[PDB]
Amino acid sequence: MEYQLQQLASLTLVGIKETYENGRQAQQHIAGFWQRCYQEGVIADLQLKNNGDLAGILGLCIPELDGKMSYMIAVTGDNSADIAKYDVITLASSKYMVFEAQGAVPKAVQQKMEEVHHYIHQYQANTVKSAPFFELYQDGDTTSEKYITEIWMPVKGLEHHHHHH
């Protein structure tokens, strides 16, 4: 599989986090979650705050300690007072395998996620199950078959993997 290595410093994310019973239960609600954020003007409002640390809007899957799975729609931002009643997290510094899903959203992203899922099975010691992974949506027509969604999977010690020696 094709991917790029990237590294991020610690970042401040601003948005809204919801929590679902698990990873599968989330998949049916995450679509509705996006829809509500658009409808209520949350996406438009968050886009104003995007400081461009990451270029686009994020959908982060955050694991919870009780097995639940949260999803956060967010942008990279900063200034606290204007941050207001949004949810805020610090995304801890990490290296990433960054994959590209080209095609109309969400189908292309769903299909690429399945492929990524199968691919990283072989990197058990390098993936970070406790760290958030995310989709990054740049500006563009998400219904275009040329549209690219990025999928960021955090990793540690990947240079030690025997496949790279």
Residues 128, 24: Cα–Cα separation, whole Å: 19
The answer to whether 156 contacts ligand P4P (rule: CB under 6 A) is no
Q: Strands, E, within 43-162: which ranges?
A: 57-63, 69-76, 87-91, 94-102, 133-137, 148-155
Q: Does residue 102 contact residue 147 with C-beta atoms inside 8 Å?
A: yes
Q: Side chain identity at 44, as an amino acid letter? A: A
Name the minimum Å distance from CB 133 to ligand P4P. 4
Is 128 near ligand P4P (CB under 6 A)?
Answer: yes
107 is a site residue for ligand P4P (CB under 6 A)? no
Considering only 51-59, 73-81, 86-94, 109-117, which stretch makes contact with ligand P4P by CB under 6 A?
109-117
Q: Should residue 73 be labelled a site residue for ligand P4P when binding is judged by CB under 6 A?
A: no
Of 16 and 116, which CB lies nearer to ligand P4P in the complex structure? 116
Residue 94 interacts with ligand P4P (CB under 6 A): yes or no: no
